[PDB]
């Protein structure tokens, strides 16, 4: 099987080798954001990972099995974005999330700005659990970027 951890999502269809995003391998399932893969199958060495679940509105997709990540921000504590920028080493950034207030409830949000290909980088709590994925967000009044902490549902 393919090792737990954080992974770059790459394509060779564009110029050279391009990082289109990032995702999480946990419990045999690969987790990323829908807008990174559009639901397409993925190669892992000589193996193929087929899409299993996805939802455009949540902007999430899982491969090889159902969504496994179920930790949630506690609403109080600092978190760490494990940013994996294109062509750059994985790096942890600690931050206190803000909040997206919506008609259907509140979710945490991280005000950190990274290239588009960093989409899908995991956000972690102090126990190392993945509380969501980075890269679906807004540009606020001063022009800066704020990403939702996007988490799926574990069945």
């Amino acid at each position: 099987e393919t090792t737990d951890g954080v992974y770059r999502v790459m394509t060779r269809r564009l110029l050279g080798s391009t990082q289109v995003g990032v995702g999480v391998m946990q419990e045999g399932v690969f987790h990323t954001m829908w807008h990174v893969t559009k639901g397409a199958a993925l190669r892992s060495g000589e193996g193929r990972l087929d899409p299993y679940w996805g939802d455009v509105k949540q902007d999430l997709v899982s491969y090889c099995g159902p969504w496994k990540l179920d930790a949630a921000w506690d609403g109080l504590s600092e978190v760490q974005l494990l940013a994996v920028p294109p062509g750059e080493r994985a790096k942890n950034i600690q931050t206190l999330p803000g909040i997206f207030k919506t008609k259907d409830g509140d979710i945490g949000a991280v005000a950190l700005d990274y290239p588009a290909g960093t989409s899908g980088s995991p956000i972690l709590d102090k126990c190392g659990r993945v509380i969501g994925l980075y890269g679906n967000g807004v540009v606020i009044k001063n022009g800066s970027y704020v990403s939702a902490i996007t988490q799926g549902k574990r069945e």
């Binding site: 954080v6 391998m25 950034i93 909040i99 991280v110």
Partner: protein, 39 residues
């Protein structure tokens, strides 16, 4: 055609850099999965 490459362990880093604000924003999520600001 897309492929994945391992980039690291998922682990909390003890002495990580600390940055970023914590804005509270009214937002709307549309059917296409796009967030927009409410004002």
């Amino acid at each position: 055609d897309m492929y994945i490459e391992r980039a690291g362990d998922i682990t909390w880093e003890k002495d990580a850099e600390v940055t970023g604000n914590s804005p509270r924003l009214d937002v709307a999520l549309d059917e296409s999965g796009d967030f927009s600001l409410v004002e």
